[PDB]
């Protein structure tokens, strides 16, 4: 049970990380997807990670 | 898993094709019938090109 | 037969790659070619067949007529050479 | 004795490594674990084991299946089965009749716990679901472990002579066995066959 729960948590974390990174890249990249600032993308990803961490306990529940 | 991947591919293709075809919201016509197929083909070709470039060596 | 957007313009690519002072460059500029009409001129031109074929092949590679001419000329050279040697 | 077997699964199940690389010499006498279903046909080859007359028993083992029918609702086209001959063991001459047609060699392998695995494998095409919703797709899988062996050849001095017409066989002729059983994987069948090995019972 513990191993399955850990695997599910890891899958959720990886999916959330990838989705937030994609959202930041889509919102940041410009000029027909040819220019982007890596540091700004990282900052956006960190900010969205913080927001999702704060939102997860409120929304993700078993009821 | 593979079925899920294919379903996601198809759903994304449909969404991106419709958002372009139905931009004006006017009723579809027999020409729009083939315009949707054209957008789907372009989407598939773009995916092929992008994946090939990503998997290009070095 | 090839639509304008499907044409790769290999001849134009070769022309661009060619040097600055070239006979093809002069022809493009507008130099006109006239076949020799005297016996001496024809005899001199007789030895330029190989160069003309080579440059035409380089220009219009994959052209049906040029490729057929190259194949036929190579086969004829081989056949005549072997017959002469025999 | 080291007991370090290699599991032939995935793309290997369809293209065995030894067949793929023509390295039967290097792969010979190696423990290989396979999964699949046997065929009903059996082949007997005269042989003496422990000084007792008997017959080595060989059976087809379908290691992969491919489906090439896009008109599923119109015709039930047969699939392309990639299989290898596996030696089920040795039986005495007097007990040859005891060999049951389509006998249950090994109990079927337990179904996987993961639910996502209940799908046609991309390479082998098998589905380990105990009750597949599609009747045509239903298939039972069993797990076996054996040793890959090299096919024998004619040897008069060794008293190894085969009369195909009279049904007398003294050396394993993988080519003839594959031809008679009408197995698609003729090249691999001629390449090599597996000899099932089980722990001391």
């Amino acid at each position: 049970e513990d191993n399955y729960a850990a695997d599910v948590q890891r899958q959720f974390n990886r999916t959330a990380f990838d989705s937030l990174y994609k959202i930041c890249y889509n919102s940041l990249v410009q000029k027909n997807g040819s220019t982007i600032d890596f540091q700004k993308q990282i900052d956006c990803h960190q900010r969205l990670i913080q927001v999702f961490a704060k939102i997860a306990p409120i929304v993700v529940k078993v009821e | 898993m593979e079925q899920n991947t294919t379903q996601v591919f198809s759903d994304l293709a449909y969404k991106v094709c419709f958002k372009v075809i139905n931009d004006k919201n006017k009723p579809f016509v027999l020409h729009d019938e083939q315009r949707l197929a054209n957008c789907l083909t372009r989407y598939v070709e773009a995916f092929n090109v992008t994946s090939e470039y990503f998997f290009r060596e070095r | 037969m090839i639509l304008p957007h499907n044409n790769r313009q290999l001849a134009r690519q070769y022309f661009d790659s060619l040097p600055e002072n070239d006979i093809n460059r002069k022809y493009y500029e507008g130099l006109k070619y006239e076949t020799p009409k005297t016996f001496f001129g024809r005899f001199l031109n007789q030895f330029n067949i190989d160069a003309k074929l080579d440059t035409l092949s380089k220009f219009y590679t994959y052209q049906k007529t040029i490729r057929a001419t190259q194949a036929e000329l190579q086969e004829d050279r081989k056949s005549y050479l072997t017959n002469s040697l025999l | 004795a080291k007991d370090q077997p290699f599991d032939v699964d995935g793309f290997d199940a369809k293209v065995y490594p030894w067949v793929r690389e023509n390295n039967v010499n290097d792969w010979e006498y190696k423990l290989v674990k396979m999964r699949g279903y046997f065929k009903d046909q059996r082949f007997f080859v005269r042989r003496k084991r422990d000084g007792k007359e008997g017959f080595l028993v060989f059976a087809p083992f379908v290691t992969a299946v491919e489906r090439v029918n896009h008109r599923l609702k119109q015709k039930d086209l047969l699939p392309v089965e990639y299989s290898v001959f596996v030696n089920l063991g040795w039986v005495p001459v007097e007990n040859k009749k005891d060999v049951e047609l389509g006998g249950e060699v090994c109990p079927p392998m337990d179904a996987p716990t993961d639910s996502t695995l209940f799908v046609n494998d991309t390479f082998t095409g098998f589905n380990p679901d105990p009750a597949n919703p599609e009747d045509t797709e239903q298939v039972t899988l069993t797990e076996i472990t054996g040793i890959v062996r090299r096919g024998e050849q004619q040897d008069i001095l060794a008293r190894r002579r085969n009369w195909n017409k009279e049904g007398i066989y003294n050396w394993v002729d993988l080519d003839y066995m594959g031809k008679i059983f009408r197995l698609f994987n003729l090249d691999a069948i001629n390449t090599a066959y597996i000899e099932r090995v089980v722990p001391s019972f």
Partner: protein, 69 residues
């Protein structure tokens, strides 16, 4: 199952970023079905930029685990 999940995630990311590049390059059109050379070049440039950004992100994350965990 971990290898299968990793492969699935990789393919999903490939599809998602291919769709993103197509949308950003505007290769989706209804007039014809053939992507022109300019559009293909735009797609390749977008793929290259995505690859470079991911490489930089992975390198910096490996060098320093700045994530709050």
């Amino acid at each position: 199952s971990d290898k299968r999940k990793i492969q699935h995630e990789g393919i999903i990311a490939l599809i998602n970023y291919s769709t993103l590049c197509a949308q950003k390059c505007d290769v989706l059109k209804g007039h014809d079905d053939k992507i022109t050379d300019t559009e293909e070049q735009c797609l390749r440039v977008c793929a290259e930029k995505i690859r470079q950004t991911f490489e930089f992100t992975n390198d910096i994350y490996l060098k320093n685990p700045n994530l709050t965990k």
